[PDB]
Structures are given as structure tokens and as C-alpha cells.
Structure 1
Amino acid sequence: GITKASLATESFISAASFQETTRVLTEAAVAGKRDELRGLKENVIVGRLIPAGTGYAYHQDRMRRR
């Protein structure tokens, strides 16, 4: 279901901007999880270009130049 599916994501900021932050931050902390940003709300949190709209060319460029 949609709230169990958005809280079970491979990106803990996406699952922490949404409902309960305690459960998700302890699960991510004891798992040692890492957030390869790669979505819209991680980049709205961290303050950069959205990887969808005009910023999709910027993220193509950055993903190409690694």
C-alpha cells in the first residue's frame, strides 16, 4: 500500500520527509544506509535542480561525467 510503499524506499530522505521519521531514521542508521539522491524530493530537500524538468539535462550531464 502507498504509505507502506513510500516508507519502504531505497532513499531514506524520501521516506523521512513523509510519515514517521523516528522509525525510518533508526532503520537507516543501524543499517548504515546511503542515499544516492536520484529523485525529486531528495533534491528539493538538499537544494539543487530537480532531476525531472529542465534539470534533467543537468543530471544527464552529471551522470555522464562520472
Structure 2
Amino acid sequence: GITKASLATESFISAASFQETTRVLTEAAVAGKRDELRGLKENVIVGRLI
């Protein structure tokens, strides 16, 4: 489904910006995940070139 495929993305900044912010951040914090800023959302956030 849409809502799950969006959250399954490896970019946690894409996931915490969609929904479920409280959960995304904690599961990413415990796995020590690193978002390498792949998609558009991520660069829109950091204020970079798409």
C-alpha cells in the first residue's frame, strides 16, 4: 500500500516528513540509520538543488 511503501523507503527524512514522525525517528535512532539524501523531499528540506 501507498502509506506503507512511503514509510518503507530507506530515507528516514522522507518518512518522518510524511507521517508517524514520533515512530520513524526512534526506529531510525536505534538502528543508527544514515540518510544519504536521495530523493526530492530530502533536498527540499536541506534547501538544496533538486
Structure 2: segments with no counterpart, 5+ residues:
none
Between Structure 1 and Structure 2, the one with more helix by share is 2
Output aligned runs, 1:2-17, within 5 Å.
2-17=2-17
CA RMSD after TM alignment: 0.5
Normalised TM-score (structure 2): 0.95
**TM-score, length of structure 1 as denominator length:** 0.73
Say which one has the larger Rg: 1
Unaligned runs of 5+ in 1: 51-66
Alpha-carbon distance between aligned partners in 2 of 1:6 and 1:31, rounded to the nearest angstrom: 18
1:8, distance to aligned residue in structure 2 (A): 1.0
Q: Which has the higher contact order (CA 8 A, sep 6+)?
A: 2
Deviation at 1:37, TM superposition (A): 0.5
The share of aligned pairs that are identical, in percent, is: 100
